Amino acid sequence: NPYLFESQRFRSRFRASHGDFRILERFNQRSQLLKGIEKYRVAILELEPQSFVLPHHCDGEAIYVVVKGQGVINIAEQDNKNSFNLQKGDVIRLFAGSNVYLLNKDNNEKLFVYVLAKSVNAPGNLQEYFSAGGQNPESFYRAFSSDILESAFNNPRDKLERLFGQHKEGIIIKASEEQIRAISEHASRSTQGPFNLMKERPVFESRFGQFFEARPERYEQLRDLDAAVGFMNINQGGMVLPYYNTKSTKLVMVIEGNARFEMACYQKIRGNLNVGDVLVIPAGHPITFVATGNSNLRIVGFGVDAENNKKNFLAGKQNIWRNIDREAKELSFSMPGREVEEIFQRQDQSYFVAGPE
Ligand SMILES: O=C(O)c1ccccc1O
Numbered sequence: 001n002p003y004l005f006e007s008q009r010f011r012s013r014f015r016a017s018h019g020d021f022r023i024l025e026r027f028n029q030r031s032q033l034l035k036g037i038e039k040y041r042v043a044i045l046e047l048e049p050q051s052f053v054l055p056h057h058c059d060g061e062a063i064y065v066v067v068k069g070q071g072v073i074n075i076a077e078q079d080n081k082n083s084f085n086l087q088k089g090d091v092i093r094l095f096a097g098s099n100v101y102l103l104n105k106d107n108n109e110k111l112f113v114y115v116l117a118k119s120v121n122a123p124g125n126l127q128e129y130f131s132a133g134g135q136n137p138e139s140f141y142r143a144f145s146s147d148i149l150e151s152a153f154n155n156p157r158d159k160l161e162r163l164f165g166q167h168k169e170g171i172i173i174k175a176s177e178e179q180i181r182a183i184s185e186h187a188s189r190s191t192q193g194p195f196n197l198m199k200e201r202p203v204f205e206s207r208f209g210q211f212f213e214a215r216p217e218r219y220e221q222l223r224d225l226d227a228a229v230g231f232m233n234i235n236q237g238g239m240v241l242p243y244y245n246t247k248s249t250k251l252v253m254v255i256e257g258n259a260r261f262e263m264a265c266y267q268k269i270r271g272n273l274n275v276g277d278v279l280v281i282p283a284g285h286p287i288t289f290v291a292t293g294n295s296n297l298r299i300v301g302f303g304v305d306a307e308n309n310k311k312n313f314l315a316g317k318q319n320i321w322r323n324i325d326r327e328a329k330e331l332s333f334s335m336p337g338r339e340v341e342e343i344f345q346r347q348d349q350s351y352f353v354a355g356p357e
Contacts, residue, residue: 134167209352252301
C-alpha cells in the first residue's frame with residue numbers, strides 16, 4: 001500500500017535533546033498518485049515532561065491537535081500575543097509566519113501533538129525558522145551581517161555575537177518551575193483559542209463506536225485550509241461499517257489500540273495499524289476499521305478538501321442502498337429485489353457494529 005506511511009517514516013529533523021519533532025515523508029514522492037495532498041505535510045511533535053520548544057515560525061498553515069498530555073502554547077504575532085494551555089483532544093490553528101513555542105507543564109505525563117501543515121512556497125516544501133537557538137539549531141539572526149544586526153538592535157557586534165551564538169542545547173530543552181509557573185500564568189485565561197474534539201456531539205454514533213469531527217463549516221479556524229479534524233473512537237472488538245468519503249482525502253493515524261483496515265482501490269489493500277502509524281484514505285475509496293487486541297481503538301485524522309464532505313456507508317440500517325429502489329437492486333445484483341432488500345436490511349445497527357471475534 002502506497003497509502004500506508006508507518007510511524008518509521010517520520011524523519012526527526014533537528015537534534016532534539018529532550019523529546020523530538022518528526023516530519024513524515026512527502027506524500028507525493030513515494031507514489032505520485034497522492035498529489036492532491038502534495039502541498040500537505042503531516043508531523044508528530046513530542047515533548048518530554050517540563051520540556052520546551054524554542055520559539056519559531058513555519059512557512060505554511062498549520063493545525064496542532066493534542067493526542068496525549070497537556071501543556072501551554074504561546075502564539076506571537078507582530079502586534080498580537082496569545083497564550084493558551086491545551087488538554088487532550090484540543091485543536092488549535094496556527095497561521096503561517098506566526099511565532100510559536102510549546103511546553104509540557106506536566107511533571108509525569110508526556111506531550112504528544114499530531115500536526116498538519118500545508119505548504120505555501122513550494123508544494124510540500126516546509127521549513128521551520130527558529131528565532132531562538134544558537135548553534136543548535138542555527139538562529140536565522142546569524143544569517144545577517146554583524147553590522148546589519150549592530151545597526152538594527154543598536155548593539156555592538158559583541159553582545160549580539162554572544163547572544164545568538166552561545167546556545168548549545170537543541171530545539172527542546174528543559175524548563176523549570178520558576179519558569180513554568182510564570183509561563184503557565186501568562187496562559188491562565190479568564191471566562192482564536194483552542195477547541196476540544198468533543199466540543200460537539202458525535203457526528204455518528206452507535207453502541208459500538210463514536211465519530212467526532214471538527215468541520216470548517218462550523219469552526220472558522222478551518223475554513224482557510226478547508227481541513228477537518230475528525231476523531232474516530234471504536235470500542236473494543238468493534239468495527240466501522242464499510243464507508244467512503246465524498247470529496248475528502250483523510251490523513252488518519254492511530255492513537256490508541258490496534259486497527260485492522262481493509263480498503264478498495266478494485267485492488268484489496270489490507271493491513272494492520274499500530275499506534276503512531278499513518279494511513280491516507282483518498283476520497284471515494286471504501287474502507288473499514290476493526291479493533292484488534294485487548295485495548296480499545298481511538299484513531300484521529302486530518303481531512304483535506306473538507307467542505308461539504310459527507311460519509312456514505314455501504315452497510316447498516318442507514319446505508320446508501322436504502323436510497324436505491326428495489327428494481328435498481330434487481331438489475332444491480334441479478335436477483336429478486338425483495339431478496340437483496342432483505343439482505344441489506346437485516347442489520348439493525350447503522351454505523352458501528354461488533355467486529356469479527
Ligand atoms: O475516514 C475518515 O473520514 C476519518 C476521519 C478522522 C479520523 C478517522 C477517519 O477514518
